[PDB]
Amino acid sequence: LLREELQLLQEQGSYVGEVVRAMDKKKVLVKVHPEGKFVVDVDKNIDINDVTPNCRVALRNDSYTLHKILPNKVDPLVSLMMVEKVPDSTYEMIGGLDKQIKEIKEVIELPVKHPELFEALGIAQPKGVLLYGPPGTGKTLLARAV
Amino acid sequence: LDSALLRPGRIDRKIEFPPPNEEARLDILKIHSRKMNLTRGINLRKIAELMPGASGAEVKGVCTEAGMYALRERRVHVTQEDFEMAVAKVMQKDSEK
Amino acid sequence: EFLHAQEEVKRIQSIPLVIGQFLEAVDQNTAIVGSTTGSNYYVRILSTIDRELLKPNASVALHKHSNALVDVLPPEADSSIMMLTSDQKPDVMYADIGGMDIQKQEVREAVELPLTHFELYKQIGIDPPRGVLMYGPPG
Amino acid sequence: DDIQQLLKKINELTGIKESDTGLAPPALWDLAADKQTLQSEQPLQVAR
Amino acid sequence: ASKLPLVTPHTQCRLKLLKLERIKDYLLMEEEFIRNQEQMKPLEEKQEEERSKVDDLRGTPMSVGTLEEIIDDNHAIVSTSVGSEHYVSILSFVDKDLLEPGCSVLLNHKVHAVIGVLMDDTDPLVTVMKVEKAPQETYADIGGLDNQIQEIKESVELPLTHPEYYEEMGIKPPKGVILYGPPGTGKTLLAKAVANQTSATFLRVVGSELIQKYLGDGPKLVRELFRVAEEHAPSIVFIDEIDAIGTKRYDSNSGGEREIQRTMLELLNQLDGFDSRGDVKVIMATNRIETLDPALIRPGRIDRKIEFPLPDEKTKKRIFQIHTSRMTLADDVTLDDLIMAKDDLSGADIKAICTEAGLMALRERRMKVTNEDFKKSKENVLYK
Amino acid sequence: PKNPDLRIAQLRFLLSLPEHRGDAAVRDELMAAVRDNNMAPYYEALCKSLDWQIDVDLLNKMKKANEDELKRLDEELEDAEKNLGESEIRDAMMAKAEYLCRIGDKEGALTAFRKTYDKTVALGHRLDIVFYLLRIGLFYMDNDLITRNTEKAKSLIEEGGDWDRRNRLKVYQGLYCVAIRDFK
C-alpha cells in the first residue's frame, strides 16, 4: 500500500460540481464554481433517486464522468438566520409577561398541537399577530421563544 | 399605521406590552442576576424601587454594567452598592435628552 | 525496507507545490481543498502529514499538475505583515490627547484590560466585548 | 380499441419514443448519419 | 397520436364500424408493411444503433450554450458560458425549429458545434404569481348580493362555458371588469369564488407590489407579466388595490411620481395595445375609485363598472347565518340585537366578531358560545 | 419537599447511633414522621424504635392522604392533555414528583425526574431537578449516583454564569468532600 502511492499519485485532480436537476437517459445537469452548466452522465455506482437536486458532486475532468456525491452545503435559510443571528430565547428568561404568554399560546401554540380543536368549533384558525408597545419590552425574545 | 391594516377582519390579535411595574422590574433583575458573581445580602427590591419603570432593557443596562464597578475596583464578587452606583448613572442617561 | 520507502514518497513535493487551502475531508486520508487559482478540488493526501495540524485556515500545498495534498504551511499574510514595531509606532502619547477622560479610560476597559486581566472577566463572567465600533464627526 | 392500441404497438416499433431532453425524431436526422458525421465535424473548424 | 379526429357518432353506427375497420386497413395492410425491414437488410438494429451513432457523435462533455442569432445554412453565432462567442455549425439532429434568440442549447466540447437544444426550467416568478389550486367554497358562501354575481358570471364565466350565446348574437364579451366600494365588503371574496369556479389559468397581483426600486423594472415586470398571461391560454388576471400605486409614495423607488406615471403608461398600453391580445380577461378591485387615472377607466379598457354597497340589515342576518353555520350556537343569543350594533358594519365585522367570540369560548374551554361572548366581543372588535 | 429533608436524616442519626440518647429523637422524629404524609422511610426506623403497636390507622390516614394527591394527579393527567400546554402532565408532576420524592421512595422520584428532564428545553428546570437528585443522592448515600449528576450538573453551568447554580453547587461538592475524608 505504501509502494502503490508512488504510482497512483500520478493522476489528475477531480472537479467539484452542483446538480441542478437530472434528465432522461442517465444524465444530469451540473454547474461548476464560475464555469458553465454541463449535461454529463453518471457512473454505475450512483442511483438517480440518490442524486438529489441542489447537491454537490465529485466529477472527473477528462470525460466529465460522475464520481461521488459531495456531502452537503447549506440550506438557503440556515445561512440566512446565520447572517441575522437572532438572540435565541426561552420561557426561562421571560420577565413577568405571563398573561401575554397565555394570549400568544392561544393564537400560535394551539393551531399546531391541536388544529382539530378549532374544527370542534367550526371557526377558522388565526394567521396574524400584532405585538405593540415601547421598545425593550421583550417582543423579539417572545416571538423567538414561541 | 394603515387603516387597511386596521380592517377588523385583517388582524387576528393585538397584544400590548406595558413597561414593567415594581413587581416586574424585580424578576428581570432576578433572571438577569444569574450569571453574576454576587455578594450575600443585596436587597434587590430596593434596587427595583430605585428604577421608576424605564423598560426591560435598562435592567440589563444596569446589571451588566455593575460588574464593571467591581472589576474596576478589582473585586471577584459584585456588591449591592455597585448597583445603586449604577442606577444613578444609567438613569442619568434617562435624564439625558 | 519500510524506512526506505518512508522517505521516497516526498518527491512529489519538490518546489512547484500547489498553494491551496484546506476545507474539509470526506473520510480518512482523502480531502477537499480550494486552490488559490479560484476553483475547488477533491484531492488526495500525503500520508506523513500529521492530520492534527489541519483545519484552521493554514495554507496547504498542492502539486501543480496532479493536484493533491503535499505539505502543510505556516501562516502567511501579505496585507500589513505585523506592524514591524521599530519605526512603526506613530509616537503619540496618552498625554497628547487632552480632554478624553471618558473614552480613553473606556476603551482601556474594553480592549487591553481583558487582554491582560482575562481571569477577572472569566471569574466574574461578564462576557468581555468581541469587537468595538467608534465613530463621530471627523477630526 | 385493439386497433387504436395496435397503433401504439407498432408506433413503438417504429421509433418516435424516448421523450427527449432536446433531441430530434430518430428518422429526421439521417443526413448526418455516416457522411456528415465525419464530414461536418472532422474537417470542419470552429472559426471563432 | 393525433391520428384521426372523427370521434362524433355516439351510437352503433356502421360508419364507426367501417372507419375503425379502415384504420384496420391502414394497420393490417401496413403491419404487413412493417414486417419486412430487418428481414431484408438487418445491417444494424436502428432502435439503438443509429441512436448510439448520434450518441457517439455527441460527447459526454455537453456544454450549455445560448442562441443570439440564426443563419439558415446550419451554422450560427452562439454564446458561450464565458461570453466569448463562436461561429460554430449546427447538426442534423437539432430539429431546426425550437431555436429562438436566447434559447439554451447543447454544444460540443471540441468544436462547440450545435448538438442539441435544452428544455427551459422556466422562471420561479410564474409559479410565484400563479395560483395553483381552488381557494375556498363557491358563490353560495357569499350571500345577499345576488345581482353582480350575474354580472361577473356574465362577463367571465358565461363567455367561457357557453360560446354559443355570443355567436347567435354576433357579439363579443366585454373586456375589462372593475370592482369598487367600501373596504371589507367582499371584493377579494368574490374573486375567491371566481377562482373556485373557473378552469382557466388564474393570476393574481396586488397593486402595491407593482412598484420597484430600479428604473424601468416596473414596466418591464408589466411586459413580462402580460407575456406570461398570454403565453399560456385562456387566462384571468386579477389586480387588487390599484389605488396604492397612486396614493402611497415610498422612498425605495428612485424615480418619483414620474416613474409610477411611466409604469401607468406601460400598463395603459398593455390593456389596449394594437397587438392581438388574446383570451385574457382582466378583473380589478379597489376602494378609492376616484383617485386613479380615468384614461384607464374608459370603455374599451374597462367595460364593466361594479359597485358594492354596504350590506342592508336583511342581508346582514343572512351573513350571520353564513358565518354561524357550522358552529355550536347556544340558544342564549339573539342575532337581531347583533344586527343593529353598528349601523354600517361590514361583512368582515361579522366574521371577526364570530371568530373572536369563539376565542372567548376557547379561553374557558367550553363547546358552545354564549351571549356575553358576543357582548364583550363587540367591545373587543368594534370599540378601541 | 426536600428543603427540610436533611434535618430528617440528621435526626435519624440522632435516633440510631447514640444508644442512651434515643428518646427525644424518637419523639420529635415521630412528631415530624407521622405528619406531612411521610410513609416509607421509617418502617425500619420503627424497628430500631419501640413497638408503637397501633400505627395502623396512622398509616391508613396518610396512605389515604397520599392516595388523594395520587388520584388528583390522576385527575390532572387527562385534563392536561386535552388542550395541551408545555406537557402539563409532566408540568404538574414535575413539581409534585418532588412531593412523591419525599413521600414515596426514590423510584417514583426517578422515573418522573428522568421523565420530566426531557420536557424543559432550558436548564432552568433541569439543573434544579439534578440538584434534587443530588440531594436524594446524599440521603440514600448514593455515592455512585452523585458522580453522574455532578458531572451532568456541571455540564450545564458553562452556558451562562449561573452562580446561584455554581456557588450553591460548590456547597454540595464541599459537603461531599467533607463527607469523605478529603479535607484539602
Ligand SMILES: Nc1ncnc2c1ncn2[C@@H]1O[C@H](COP(=O)(O)OP(=O)(O)OP(=O)(O)O)[C@@H](O)[C@H]1O
Ligand atoms: N486632544 C485632541 N483632541 C481632539 N483633536 C486633537 C487633539 N490633539 C490634536 N488634535 C487634532 O485633531 C486631529 C485628529 O486627527 P485624527 O486623524 O484622529 O482625526 P479623526 O477624528 O480621525 O478625523 P478623520 O477621520 O477625518 O481623520 C489631528 O489632526 C490633530 O491636529
Ligand SMILES: Nc1ncnc2c1ncn2[C@@H]1O[C@H](COP(=O)(O)OP(=O)(O)OP(=O)(O)O)[C@@H](O)[C@H]1O
Ligand atoms: N357580503 C359578504 N358576505 C359574507 N362575507 C363577507 C362579505 N363581504 C366580506 N366578507 C368577508 O370579509 C372578508 C374580507 O372581504 P374582502 O377581502 O372581499 O374585502 P375587500 O373589499 O376585498 O377589501 P380590499 O379590497 O380593500 O382588500 C372576507 O374574508 C369575507 O369572508
Ligand SMILES: Nc1ncnc2c1ncn2[C@@H]1O[C@H](COP(=O)(O)OP(=O)(O)O)[C@@H](O)[C@H]1O
Ligand atoms: N421578561 C423579560 N425577562 C428577561 N429579559 C427581558 C424581559 N423583557 C425584556 N428583556 C430584555 O430585553 C431584551 C429583548 O428585548 P425585546 O423587547 O425582545 O426586543 P425589541 O426591543 O426589539 O422588542 C433581552 O436581551 C432581555 O435581556
Ligand SMILES: [Mg+2]
Ligand atoms: Mg379584500
